Amino acid sequence: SMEQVAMELRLTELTRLLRSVLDQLQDKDPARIFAQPVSLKEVPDYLDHIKHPMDFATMRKRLEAQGYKNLHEFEEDFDLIIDNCMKYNARDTVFYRAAVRLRDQGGVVLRQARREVDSIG
Numbered sequence: 001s002m003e004q005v006a007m008e009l010r011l012t013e014l015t016r017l018l019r020s021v022l023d024q025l026q027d028k029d030p031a032r033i034f035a036q037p038v039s040l041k042e043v044p045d046y047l048d049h050i051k052h053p054m055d056f057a058t059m060r061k062r063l064e065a066q067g068y069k070n071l072h073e074f075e076e077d078f079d080l081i082i083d084n085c086m087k088y089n090a091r092d093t094v095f096y097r098a099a100v101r102l103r104d105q106g107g108v109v110l111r112q113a114r115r116e117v118d119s120i121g
Contacts, residue, residue, distance in 0.1 A: 014071075021113045028105040036057050052080055081102070086100070
């Protein structure tokens, strides 16, 4: 149908907007602490701690399959990256500190993304 196409155009455009958001969030991680999944070869116990692992490469796969239906789903995944890190790693670690800084800096980007998503529909 013509509606299904219109719908698909909106999703594609949401995907366009979320790709730019993702690139902006990922620039706030210059050390690439969050770029890839935590290695289960190197942290064999990780899944005993963290039930829903997340990382920027895994988000990108979902993104490019147009697997985010709305900003809320995308934010859920970004918050998992931060929240998983802040649980697994102690406060006095480079990892925890990197998550705090990503959260703080990402807030600004996510704030405007919400306005853009509501605004453009």
